[PDB]
């Protein structure tokens, strides 16, 4: 049974899942649009959008909490200098998922995920 | 096959 549970296992263990979403959130902050599978893009909103909410108040403790969750000073710098001031009057919904075709090697349903003002 | 293991 599965009732009322959250989170996708994605055929990984938990430390692989956490390392994978730290890399994917850093790539989405860097390039502002990536292509991945659709279930990974749906599980990435619950990772990336709290970092943008964290970057709407600038403090030393919020930089350190973003560095603890991203481990990249370039990503924390872009979160707190650029993405924070962009989304300062937007209550959530910082990303947008666009479904695209199927991956050629395994028929995987692919999707784009971007930031809203790109 | 080692048939002699069968208990007769």
């Amino acid at each position: 049974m599965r009732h009322r549970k959250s989170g996708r296992q994605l055929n990984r263990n938990s430390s692989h899942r956490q390392a994978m979403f730290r890399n994917m959130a850093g790539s989405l902050v860097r390039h502002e649009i990536i292509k991945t599978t659709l279930p990974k893009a749906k599980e990435l909103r619950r990772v990336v959008e709290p970092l943008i909410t964290l970057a709407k108040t600038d403090s030393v403790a919020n930089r350190r909490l973003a560095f603890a969750r991203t481990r990249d000073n370039e990503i924390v710098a872009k979160l707190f200098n650029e993405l924070g001031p962009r989304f300062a009057s937007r209550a959530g919904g910082y990303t947008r998922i666009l479904k695209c075709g199927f991956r050629a090697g395994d028929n995987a349903p692919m999707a784009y995920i971007e930031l809203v003002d790109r | 096959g080692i048939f002699s293991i069968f208990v007769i």
Binding site: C100, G101, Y112 | -
Partner: protein
């Protein structure tokens, strides 16, 4: 465990009577290109619901 008799070509086609594929009925037309695409998917030329979403 294995069969005791050879199954016929009739029973094989009866088992394969649920194997047929479904063709997509729903090809939409994009409202600025007029090109077909899947429903709720972007087009091949990078449009979606009237706008150029990827400039590639």
């Amino acid at each position: 465990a294995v069969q005791q008799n050879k199954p016929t070509r009739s029973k094989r086609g009866m088992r394969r009577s649920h194997d047929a594929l479904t063709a997509v009925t729903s090809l939409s037309v994009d409202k600025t290109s007029g090109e077909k695409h899947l429903r709720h998917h972007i087009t091949a030329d990078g449009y979606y619901r009237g706008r150029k979403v990827i400039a590639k």
